[PDB]
Design a protein around this ligand. Structure first.
Ligand SMILES: Nc1ncnc2c1ncn2[C@@H]1O[C@H](COP(=O)(O)OP(=O)(O)OP(=O)(O)O)[C@@H](O)[C@H]1O
Ligand SMILES: [Mg+2]
Lengths: 422, 75, 155
């Protein structure tokens, strides 16, 4: 029979994205585990204890702190990162020395970090095979278009990596720091101006609804110990997550026209914090908050989200960033990348951002058909990188590219392997 | 239409006219002006439908490399 | 021990005749400032990446002044010179003569082509809207040629 089918090797596919790491098996369709990119630490006792499971971190503990690992898509705190990887392997009950491991990572990465990761995976965990495919190529693999312009809209970094014929263009990456973190800080300072104090979930033990903007009754369960600031920040991150999920909505730069009307319609919504303070949000504030991704009009410095330029006079915003990325491409392949725009990123779920992005791109780039491709399924938007990793590991011909432990020893220098075998 | 335009015949008519004859005359006039504008745009080398032929690499079109088979399995 | 593990059938490698230091004597005659190191680097890049010009120029690291068409022209002229020097004793025909033929390219034409394409892509919105309207109206007049021709013949 003709070999249309691909061969599956049971190879684990690992991801190290900025906010969440998504492990899974080879030929499946969904990641088995997706832990957040944080690792706990408790030093109350003389010894040291680590807490890595997502559920176990959220509970209060006497002396407990939470430290970030994935800063900007590059691995940091490698000593804790390897511990998290080992725990994640142990929970999955993976069998070493008989399963290849495919590791995905961002476009920009330190060479020393790659060397350390490969050395640990090949000499400590004793995995037989390894590989390091770049994240934008892997996302393109997930969506099945081998010639596309990946436009990521993640939490920390917005990355636009052009891809020609299935491989990324390293020098053509445009990295802007205006991303979900910018929205988080901006909405935090908006909450600060309004005087609303967000309380964590664990503090609330008995509460009653109160729609008035004034303070509301909320019985507090106070523990004997003291709570760290990082713990409270991580807990508040969840509340900002649902609040960004629900409140935000973007419109095509017509906010100034209906600025007066929106108060007249009284279309404000309420977001109930665990405290119970159902804070009203006028439609103008939500619309401006959503549009802030596309033009950073906020002049309050963004609370440590300062002015940034490509590969980081005025921050450009998403639409002009995409226009700049398109312009630098050669005219030979510019229409090919224009007609195939893959927009990944969980922040794309904000209604209307993709539609007005398409409108701005087609208006500001006349005569070049710009069709934006996204995904209807939520799991495809959220974990496209792992989908691409799984499909690449399941591919038959790809198997002539695995990096072996004996091959790594014989070559010795990681420079030769990284340039050729990636 | 331009080998013998109708706008020359209509003033010289010896038979009863009709709206339809003037319809046809206006339509051929529109044909003429559209073609004239097309030619004027082509002369200025601003016509998108006319482009220079692009070079083709002889090596790529002959044999399939490993990456292309991998991309078939991809799709 | 089914050595034909499938998928090895596709371990096809694109073949590009190579040059060594000795063969550079034939290449000695040919802001360019080309030399042995740059040529061998170009050939290694073209052998590794399966002749994809944008990825080759992007992964290129010897020096940044090298432009797409310069690389293309240098590669084509080196290939044709080597091939002709390799069909000198026994005349080359068929497929190989045909490639030699195509490789009688020209770098100036393409830069003209690329400049022309950029100029067209840089046109104002009004001009390109007018062009689109002209094409639409031309096709609209196209679709009813038969009836118009018959009516003109009758008139
Ligand atoms: N429906 C939603 N709309 C908008 N933002 C959301 C939504 N759901 C979650 N978020 C938040 O938006 C951010 C999106 O992070 P995402 O998971 O896409 O990043 P990642 O996997 O770390 O990868 P990368 O940042 O490199 O693109 C997170 O902070 C997440 O909590
Ligand atoms: Mg991320």
């Amino acid at each position: 029979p003709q070999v249309y089918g691909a061969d599956e090797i049971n190879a684990v596919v690992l991801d190290a994205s900025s906010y969440r790491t998504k492990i899974g098996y080879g030929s499946l369709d969904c990641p088995i585990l997706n832990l957040p990119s944080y690792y706990g630490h408790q030093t109350k006792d003389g010894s040291e204890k680590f807490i890595f499971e997502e559920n176990s971190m959220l509970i209060p503990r006497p002396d407990y702190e939470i430290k970030k690992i994935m800063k900007d898509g590059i691995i940091d705190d490698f000593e804790g990162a390897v511990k998290q990887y080992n725990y994640m392997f142990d929970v999955l009950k993976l069998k070493p020395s008989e399963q290849p491991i495919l590791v995905i990572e961002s476009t920009q990465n330190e060479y020393e970090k790659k060397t350390a990761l490969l050395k640990q995976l090949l000499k400590e965990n004793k995995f037989v095979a390894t590989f390091l495919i770049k994240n934008p190529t892997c996302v393109s693999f997930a969506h099945g278009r081998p010639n596309c312009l990946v436009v990521d809209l993640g939490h920390d970094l917005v990355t636009i990596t052009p891809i020609l014929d299935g491989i990324s263009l390293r020098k053509q990456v445009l990295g802007t720091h205006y991303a979900g973190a910018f929205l988080s800080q901006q909405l935090r300072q908006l909450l600060n101006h309004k005087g609303v104090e967000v309380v964590p979930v664990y503090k609330v033990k008995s509460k009653v609804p109160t729609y008035f903007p004034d303070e509301a009754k909320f019985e507090e369960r106070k523990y004997d110990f003291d709570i760290s600031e990082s713990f409270e920040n991580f807990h508040k991150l969840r509340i900002l997550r649902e609040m960004k999920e629900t409140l935000l909505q973007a419109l095509p730069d017509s906010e100034t026209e209906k600025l007066k009307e929106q108060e007249t319609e009284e279309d404000t919504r309420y977001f109930e914090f665990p405290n119970g303070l159902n804070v009203p949000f006028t439609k103008y504030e939500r619309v401006r908050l959503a549009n802030s991704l596309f033009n950073p009009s906020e002049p309050y410095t963004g609370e440590s989200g300062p002015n940034i330029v490509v590969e980081g006079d005025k921050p450009r915003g998403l639409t002009s960033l995409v226009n700049q990325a398109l312009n630098h491409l050669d005219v030979d392949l510019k229409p090919q990348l224009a007609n195939n725009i893959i927009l990944t990123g969980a922040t794309s779920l904000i209604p209307g951002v993709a539609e007005r992005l398409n409108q701005e791109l087609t208006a500001m780039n006349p005569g070049l058909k710009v069709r934006i491709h996204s995904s209807a399924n939520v799991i495809e938007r959220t974990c496209s990188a792992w989908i691409g990793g799984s499909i690449l590991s399941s591919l038959g011909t790809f198997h002539q590219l695995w990096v072996s432990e004996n091959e790594y020893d014989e070559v010795g220098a990681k420079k030769l392997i990284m340039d050729r075998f990636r | 239409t331009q080998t013998f335009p109708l706008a020359k015949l209509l003033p010289r008519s010896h038979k009863s006219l009709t709206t339809d004859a003037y319809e046809s005359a206006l339509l051929e006039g529109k044909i003429a002006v559209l073609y004239s504008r097309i030619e004027e745009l082509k002369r200025q080398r601003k016509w998108s439908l006319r482009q220079p032929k692009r070079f083709i690499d002889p090596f790529t079109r002959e044999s399939p490399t490993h990456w292309d088979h991998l991309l078939a399995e991809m799709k | 021990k089914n050595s034909p593990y499938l998928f090895e059938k596709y371990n096809q490698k694109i073949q590009i005749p190579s040059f060594t230091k000795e063969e550079y004597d034939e290449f000695l005659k040919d802001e360019a400032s080309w030399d042995y190191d740059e040529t061998v680097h170009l050939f290694q890049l073209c052998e590794k990446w399966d002749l994809r010009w944008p990825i080759i120029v992007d992964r290129y690291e010897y020096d940044e002044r090298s432009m797409e068409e310069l690389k293309e022209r240098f590669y084509k002229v080196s290939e044709r010179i080597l091939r002709h020097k390799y069909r000198n004793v026994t005349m080359d025909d068929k497929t190989s003569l045909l490639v030699q033929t195509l490789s009688s390219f020209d770098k100036r034409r393409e830069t003209e082509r690329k400049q022309y394409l950029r100029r067209l892509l840089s046109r104002s919105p009004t001009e390109i809207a007018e062009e689109e309207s002209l094409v639409i109206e031309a096709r609209k007049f196209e679709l009813a040629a038969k009836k118009m021709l018959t009516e003109r013949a009758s008139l």
